[PDB]
Ligand binder design. Structure first.
Ligand SMILES: [Mg+2]
Ligand SMILES: [Mg+2]
Ligand SMILES: [Mg+2]
Lengths: 402, 395
């Protein structure tokens, strides 16, 4: 028209190859069609270093203010990255920071095409990973205890009452880690999962190791059971779907023999691992949608994958790459859809439906980046480099006048 | 006559796997060997009598004699304490034993020519090299019902206290602390780099060192140091690589790989990933599992669970198609070593057999339900466990 927006999208930029691709998507796919309103936050590793990570806090506060963010893939610096970039320090994960500030559950679902069959034989139906976005080792405290010692966790409440437990007592160099979660957050996580399963009419599976983690993981098991029995058991029976709880090593065994079609609830760490397992097995890592659904009414759409470092070095050498931009696209269309829905601007939502359908129909016709070409049946017609792929969807958008 | 020095140590299970220990003893080893066993009933009812002492006694016996054999046990949750006659939710006997010995648990699929793996690209076996020590298997935990300041605290022998804050919260919270030692991580690294030269397989290792900058990153640092300084050149010379990446990345790669590497694993990942690997290759029962201590003791075990759900179902009319192949290969691995150290080559050449026969059997189309569901061409007969052992005797 161009399509009009009422509220800005909060836009969080990122690193490496996905940072290169981000402007191509906007320039070729969105800006010809939508008069795009965003509040831009650069969460590139250099901007985070330049502002001592403050820009991450700003972006998260902007998501809370406007309601919906879209996030590009970022580097979390370790010792290698600090060296590579000249960093002041090993900054904390911007994802960990944003998710802590929002709370919620990250729903991760493969983006399926008809010409790619899953790596796992039995899998017919999509598997959705519902990842708790809050706590555990994404807000860790750690110590390199270079002389060993008595290793403990200590809680001191607001009246000054302390409780202490000994992890171990050793007399040699050791490492110590502590994590937390909250009762309230685990509750929001169970509810978000139970709500998602009902809405989508799929079973819900959850698993921890509550036989080893007798108070921590067992707390998650307890809360899911009580919330389920007190609030969802009957809606579940009415909708004809089931909650299934088991141990985590066991759930992954069953997952290898399952036909899929369930919501796999996961603790924060497990959901990181298993969401990559699931994306990879269904297709490739780029073929996955990811949305953080917060209990406070915010949404953050993101890619689940990383910044494709190896393709980036190729790009810096002046090479074209066939980097799959699909998860970045779905982040944009996932965010713009939610924005238009919140705003009562359904032509924005309509555009999003189209750009998603065009992406799928392009790949299914045999026009695709190299990750998908390696695995499609029948063989691709054309193995497009990133820019060509994005131009091809651009062309299809135009051939509707959109 | 029957074959014959030192008692291989013996720990015994719970539920359905206990029920199948006699049958392997009686039918597959007793008629053909002098069976010296130091018996420790690690059943849930026994540990709840002896206050779990039987587990410690039991693990000292393995320290004392040298080589153990363990049946799948149960580890108790509040559910198991409502269920059984139980004083406490006792700690995992596996955790207990593996704390006391240390090591790396190597876990490999028991492969068989008529089962296609679940993962289409897997053409070679994948070994899991699971660190047996520390992390959350030796945890401290508090339910902070009034919230507060949540911390880890280290006091060294000279009274130096170091504190780090996990979070301060104004609401109920759960709190967990865990540890490892630099020494045990070093041993685990070396254990894995050796397995890889001694099997001439590549080594893959993975943690989340970008999130856990002092804990996981220490593992990462220790692997790359020990490999730069002790194995870089032994690896180029053997034609093999050490590969390090992020845990989420490695598992993404595992689904597109052809297999045939050593997957080095932290303690918790090794637990999850060996079940994934076992199950994708065939079934959970189709897996070997040996604790190799750096001290160095051995513990040859199941890996899978006591088969609850299958136990009741035996508590009526004996519907038993349970796959014993893993209980069996714990013995054939354990004697293959109990007699490898007892000098006698008259036990390596027998063991080489009790297993090779188990295979030939399955490969010829006589096998348990789990296997019959997934083999091709279709199974000739679906034998039940009781009748599966029989077939493996007796010349
Ligand atoms: Mg991830
Ligand atoms: Mg990457
Ligand atoms: Mg396990």
């Amino acid at each position: 028209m161009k399509i009009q927006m009422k509220t800005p999208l909060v836009e969080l930029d990122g690193d490496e190859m996905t940072r290169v691709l981000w402007p191509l998507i906007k320039d070729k796919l969105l800006l010809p069609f939508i008069d795009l309103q965003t509040e831009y936050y650069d969460l590139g590793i250099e901007e985070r270093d330049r502002t001592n990570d403050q820009i991450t806090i700003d972006a998260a506060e902007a998501i809370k203010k406007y309601g919906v963010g879209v996030k590009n893939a970022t580097i979390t610096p370790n010792q290698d990255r600090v060296e590579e970039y000249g960093l002041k320090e090993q900054w904390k994960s911007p994802n960990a920071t944003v998710r802590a500030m929002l709370d919620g559950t990250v729903f991760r679902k493969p983006i399926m095409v008809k010409n790619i069959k899953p790596s796992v034989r039995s899998w017919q139906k999509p598997i959705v990973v519902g990842r708790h976005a809050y706590g555990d080792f994404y807000k860790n405290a750690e110590i390199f205890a270079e002389a060993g010692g008595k290793l403990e966790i200590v809680v001191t409440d607001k009246n000054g009452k302390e409780t202490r437990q000994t992890i171990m007592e050793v007399d040699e160099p050791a490492i110590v880690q502590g994590i937390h979660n909250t009762v309230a957050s685990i509750g929001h996580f169970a509810r978000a999962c139970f709500e998602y399963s009902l809405d989508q009419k799929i079973d819900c599976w959850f698993a921890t190791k509550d036989t080893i983690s007798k108070q921590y993981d067992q707390r998650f098991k307890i809360i899911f059971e009580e919330i389920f029995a007190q609030e969802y058991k009957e809606k579940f029976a009415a909708a004809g779907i089931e909650y299934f709880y088991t141990l985590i090593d066991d759930v992954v065994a069953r997952m290898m023999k399952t036909e899929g079609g369930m919501l796999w609830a996961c603790k924060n760490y497990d959901g990181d691992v298993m969401s990559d397992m699931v994306a990879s097995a269904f297709g490739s890592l780029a073929m996955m949608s990811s949305v953080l659904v917060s209990p406070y009414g915010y949404f953050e759409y993101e890619a689940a994958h990383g910044t494709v470092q190896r393709h980036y070095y190729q790009h810096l050498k002046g090479e074209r790459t066939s980097t799959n931009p699909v998860a970045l696209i779905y982040a944009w269309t996932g965010a713009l859809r939610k924005r238009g829905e919140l705003d009562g601007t359904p032509d924005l939502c309509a555009f999003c439906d189209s750009l998603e359908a065009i992406t799928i129909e392009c790949i299914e016709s045999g026009y695709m980046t190299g990750d998908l070409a390696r695995i499609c049946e029948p063989a691709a017609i054309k193995v497009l480099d990133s820019i060509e792929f994005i131009d091809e969807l651009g062309k299809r958008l135009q051939q509707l006048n959109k």
